[PDB]
RNA sequence: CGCAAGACGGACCAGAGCGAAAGCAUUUGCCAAGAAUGUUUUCAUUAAUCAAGAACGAAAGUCGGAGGUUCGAAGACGAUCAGAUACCGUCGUAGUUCCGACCAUAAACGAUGCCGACCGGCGAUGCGGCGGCGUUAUUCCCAUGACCCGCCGGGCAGCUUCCGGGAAACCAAAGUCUUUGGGUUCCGGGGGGAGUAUGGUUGCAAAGCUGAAACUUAAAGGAAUUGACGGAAGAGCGAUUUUUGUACACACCGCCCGU
């Protein structure tokens with residue numbers, strides 16, 4: 171009868187200043203009829219963007235969730251909301267004749283953002299190894315997991331969210347963990363695979379504007 | 384009617400393809416997945432319960448949804464392929480590949496493909512019993 | 519007859535006897 | 544008359560093994576006895592590869608792969624012909640079939 | 645995009661490990677227990693198997709409380725069918741989950757009791773110890789982790805052999821048996837009647853343990869061979885010398901079960 175798309179309007183969504191590319195696409199919303207405000211429906215949306223669409227030279231198997239925080243006249247302003255890996259990357263990392271070690275921590279940044287970080291690593295076969303399997307004993311696994319947890323804790327609570335995302339973009343935490351665990355048992359494919367937002371501080375417009383410039 | 388975008392740039396959407404063994408869904412949403420552009424199911428094309436999952440119905444639904452979203456102003460689509468998941472099979476139905484190929488035929492640009500089948504860490508008991516479905 | 523069902527039939531017959539052959543009787 | 548020395552399963556030095564569910568019929572079958580198959584394939588088929596490589600917005604964009612673990616009971620494995628009966632002498636040979644050309 | 649409840653810990657996960665057996669898989673902490681290895685420590689026969697008597701013992705089931713997501717006996721329907729009271733599909737009650745009391749049964753299987761001695765090779769694998777060129781990490785140094793080459797001791801297994809066994813299938817034990825004796829516990833005596841009746845005993849119940857006879861019958865049964873069928877793909881005692889299964893051999897037009 172009456173076209174629902176005649177009352178729709180298009181908005182442009184921007185990424186925070188941490189990333190090179192800022193315009194991450196467009197979105198749609200119904201105009202305000204006085205009952206429902208377009209801004210209210212516009213806020214709270216989550217966008218999963220591949221890192222290769224945010225930074226030119228970075229990998230594409232790392233995705234970032236960005237949540238719209240404020241609307242500035244046809245410009246949705248997003249903020250960091252999460253990070254994850256693609257399904258096929260994780261499926262290809264897990265293989266049958268090796269050990270997998272996983273860890274998770276709950277760390278609060280200096281500016282109030284509470285995060286839950288997950289880390290995964292795999293034991294590596296030696297260059298001249300003749301034995302088919304590469305298994306780490308339980309105490310070695312526990313030591314590796316504790317080394318993961320302490321490194322992930324010391325790289326978040328000291329910094330703030332802006333510096334945390336900067337470390338996440340090349341995933342320097344995984345490289346630090348991989349280097350630190352060489353003495354216990356060699357590890358390859360060490361990554362921080364998921365990051366969850368648990369608690370946010372009270373919303374501040376000035377903080378958002380400093381985050382976007 | 385749509386975004387004001389230069390000819391060079393592509394307007395992007397996300398296509399959720401649900402390929403079951405009984406039906407096929409091609410759904411188009413914005414990048415946030417909260418706004419629906421067009422949803423066409425394989426059961427809308429064929430008037431039979433056998434052919435809802437057939438490759439032909441998937442091809443028809445893909446063309447219909449491609450035309451509808453081309454009307455509004457979406458030129459490229461990201462692909463999220465989904466199976467039924469859960470306790471049941473993780474293998475996509477026979478309409479996924481045909482729907483994707485038909486969507487490519489209609490002139491749509493293709494973004495990144497991603498498998499989004501729900502995978503439990505462990506789940507509730509599956510339907511069927513100890514001895515399974517004996518047909 | 520399958521031995522399982524033969525055993526079940528014997529048990530049911532014994533239960534029926536026990537109901538009929540009451541200890542009070 | 545024992546047909547196999549290992550009783551058709553891989554249980555040694557343990558009592559109980561948790562059961563899994565057949566992908567085909569949802570039957571309960573012990574994990575060591577079940578027939579396992581790891582399938583790594585392409586999301587898009589052969590013709591779809593050429594049809595998609597031209598419509599993509601990226602250059603040399605690699606198509607994702609599908610990884611699936613499949614479990615079968617004996618009846619479904621035999622009926623689906625992923626497993627066949629062998630001779631009395633050929634049963635002992637447990638080398639995987641020469642799929643590598 | 646959030647919220648709530650309950651149940652389960654995928655992939656890694658293996659002819660890998662632990663436990664007396666049932667059984668045991670998210671992280672961290674606490675508590676007690678244990679095998680193996682190392683030992684120029686201590687006691688000095690304290691040991692093996694076991695009537696009586698005890699602890700534990702899958703699932704299902706029973707009685708009280710708490711929760712009830714999924715699945716789901718019984719049940720109500722829809723299909724299929726000559727007929728279905730079944731297989732298939734929609735719901736769905738006990739139950740499936742936790743706590744406290746019962747129950748003591750499984751193809752509870754390696755269908756193989758435990759302790760000790762002897763009797764062929766080979767390559768791996770898990771734990772502990774010992775020795776040794778060489779690559780890697782702890783920025784240097786030893787030393788300790790990850791690899792590599794070996795040796796010893798327990799452990800789960802594998803391949804091979806005219807060691808010898810056995811009706812054979814097969815077994816390094818199922819060997820060291822008419823050339824018959826290392827110690828010891830349980831237990832069988834043609835097929836049915838029958839694990840039935842009765843007595844005793846245990847239990848709330850369901851049932852558990854012990855356990856006959858009258859009568860009836862010339863075979864029942866094991867391993868292997870050649871055929872026939874299928875809605876499946878010089879060597880052996882000897883018969884005998886496309887794959888596979890068989891309870892068929894008057895060979896599926898077979899055989900056979902219960903009202």
Ligand SMILES: [Mg+2]
Nearest residue numbers: 405432433435
């Ligand atoms: Mg259908």
Ligand SMILES: [Mg+2]
Nearest residue numbers: 406426432435
């Ligand atoms: Mg339908």
Ligand SMILES: [Mg+2]
Nearest residue numbers: 517518618622
């Ligand atoms: Mg069948």
Ligand SMILES: [Mg+2]
Nearest residue numbers: 558559702752
């Ligand atoms: Mg058992």
Ligand SMILES: [Mg+2]
Nearest residue numbers: 551552576577
């Ligand atoms: Mg098998």
Ligand SMILES: [Mg+2]
Nearest residue numbers: 556557662663
């Ligand atoms: Mg043991």
Ligand SMILES: [Mg+2]
Nearest residue numbers: 504653654670
């Ligand atoms: Mg896990």
Ligand SMILES: [Mg+2]
Nearest residue numbers: 695696697698
């Ligand atoms: Mg006794």
Ligand SMILES: [Mg+2]
Nearest residue numbers: 702703704705
């Ligand atoms: Mg029980």
Ligand SMILES: [Mg+2]
Nearest residue numbers: 704705739740
């Ligand atoms: Mg119970």
Ligand SMILES: [Mg+2]
Nearest residue numbers: 706707708709
């Ligand atoms: Mg109760």
Ligand SMILES: [Mg+2]
Nearest residue numbers: 512732733734
């Ligand atoms: Mg039913």
Ligand SMILES: [Mg+2]
Nearest residue numbers: 510715716735
């Ligand atoms: Mg149901």
Ligand SMILES: [Mg+2]
Nearest residue numbers: 748749750752
């Ligand atoms: Mg018994």
Ligand SMILES: [Mg+2]
Nearest residue numbers: 550751753754
């Ligand atoms: Mg067994």
Ligand SMILES: [Mg+2]
Nearest residue numbers: 751752753755
């Ligand atoms: Mg027995």
